[PDB]
């Protein structure tokens, strides 16, 4: 199933992004490092999502341009 394939692939990516958060055995400094890793990952995802938002705004405006030209080309 192509839709099944999409759902399965997205869930696979979801699973992959789930790193092994098995770390209590670490000491204080290592766990602080891991927390910073998570924090930096979150901030980078924030940057990625902001880029997605601005690119979506651009895509919507360009689709408006496209529809304008379509109407012009009656």
């Amino acid at each position: 199933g192509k839709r099944q394939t999409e759902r399965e692939k997205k869930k696979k990516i979801l699973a992959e992004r789930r790193k092994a958060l098995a770390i209590d055995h670490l000491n204080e400094d290592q766990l602080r490092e891991k927390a910073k890793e998570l924090w930096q990952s979150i901030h980078n995802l924030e940057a990625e999502k902001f880029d997605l938002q601005e690119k979506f705004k651009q895509q919507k405006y360009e689709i408006n341009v496209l529809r304008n030209r379509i109407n012009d080309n009656q």
Partner: protein, 371 residues
């Protein structure tokens, strides 16, 4: 908000917002990949032309319908057709509109469940409902009783209804429809010399069938007349010239409806499956069904069918009952008009399959109370 009354059909997809008189966009449901190589660079050649675009470039495509007989045989192509219908022919995102699909009676369950799963996962509609294609055609006539013969292009089915109570044991579904008539016409045209083989030329034969064929009131007399005089031979101009002349192929193509032995089918014609569907009903509602016989669907648009069918049923039925055949001029879109009326009702507003309900019971919700 407003509801989207889509109607997949088989041969023409008809869609439009609920509450209007006619579907907004009507276009053939064909998806055709190009088949030749292609030498011009940068021409912007796509990989699949769907809908009405592939009826203009059909010279270099291989059109293939994604719906064979009511059932859907190629789910990817059907998804493509739906995506086109939503985004380019109506230009309304499905995230903000309920949908009302239509389905033939006695179809496989898996088809309906996959349809609802697609509508809820890919297009992500708020709520969708699936309705039987004959009840809508009964809505459009403004009746509440009557036995409706909905001879589409994929499958011909005959659902009797009384006082709003459908009779599930009297549905007679027959798989002869417009497509088989097109194939039979394409097969009998070879008796004069015209050979149509390519899947693109099936469209030309369909146009010939639509514009020229008619149903004879009496078959033997017409066969005798066409074999002596020449008052029937009507000519038609192909898409390139070389006019053709159709003789007694005119009324022999749609005669297959009343004698399915022509294409080798065993069953009885549409004139006798209606009488059989009536006789399975109870003895006290047969008069009302006799008086309110309804025609619908595209294939019942042949000039002169509402008289041939009435003559046949009057021959079969008891002499006292009155036989009346309702044939509205808006036959082709009758199902969609009925769908619009049903979606516009206030009493119906709580029958939709809401998305949270689907999340709790899975796609098998459609067979449950929300039918």
């Amino acid at each position: 908000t407003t509801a989207l009354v889509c109607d997949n059909g088989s041969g023409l997809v008809k869609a439009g917002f609920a509450g209007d008189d006619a579907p907004r966009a009507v276009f053939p449901s064909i998806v055709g990949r190009p088949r030749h190589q292609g030498v011009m660079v940068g021409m912007g050649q796509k990989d699949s032309y769907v809908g009405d675009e592939a009826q203009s470039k059909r010279g270099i495509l291989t059109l293939k319908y994604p719906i064979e007989h009511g059932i859907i045989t190629n789910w990817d192509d059907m998804e493509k057709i739906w995506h086109h219908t939503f985004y380019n022919e109506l230009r309304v995102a499905p995230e903000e509109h309920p949908t009302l699909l239509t389905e033939a009676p006695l179809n496989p369950k898996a088809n309906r469940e996959k349809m609802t799963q697609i509508m809820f996962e890919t297009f992500n509609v708020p709520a969708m409902y699936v309705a039987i294609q004959a009840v809508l055609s009964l809505y459009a006539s403004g009746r509440t009783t009557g036995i409706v013969l909905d001879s589409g292009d994929g499958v011909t089915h005959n659902v009797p209804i009384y006082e709003g109570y459908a009779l599930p044991h009297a549905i007679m579904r027959l798989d002869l429809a417009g497509r088989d008539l097109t194939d039979y016409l394409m097969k009998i045209l070879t008796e004069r010399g015209y050979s149509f083989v390519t899947t693109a030329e099936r469209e030309i034969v369909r146009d010939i069938k639509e514009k020229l064929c008619y149903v004879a009131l009496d078959f033997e007399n017409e066969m005798a007349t066409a074999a002596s005089s020449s008052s029937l031979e009507k000519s038609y101009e192909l898409p390139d010239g070389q006019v053709i002349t159709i003789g007694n192929e005119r009324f022999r193509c749609p005669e297959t409806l009343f004698q399915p032995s022509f294409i080798g089918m065993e069953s009885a014609g549409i004139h006798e499956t209606t009488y059989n569907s009536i006789m399975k009903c109870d003895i006290d509602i047969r008069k009302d069904l006799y008086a309110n016989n309804v025609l619908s669907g595209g294939t019942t648009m042949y000039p002169g069918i509402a008289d041939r069918m009435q003559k046949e049923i009057t021959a079969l039925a008891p002499s006292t009952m009155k036989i009346k055949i309702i044939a509205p001029p808006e036959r082709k879109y009758s199902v969609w008009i009925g769908g619009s009326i049903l979606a516009s009702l206030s009493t119906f507003q709580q029958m939709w399959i809401s998305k949270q309900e689907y999340d709790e019971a899975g796609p098998s919700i459609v067979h449950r109370k929300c039918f």
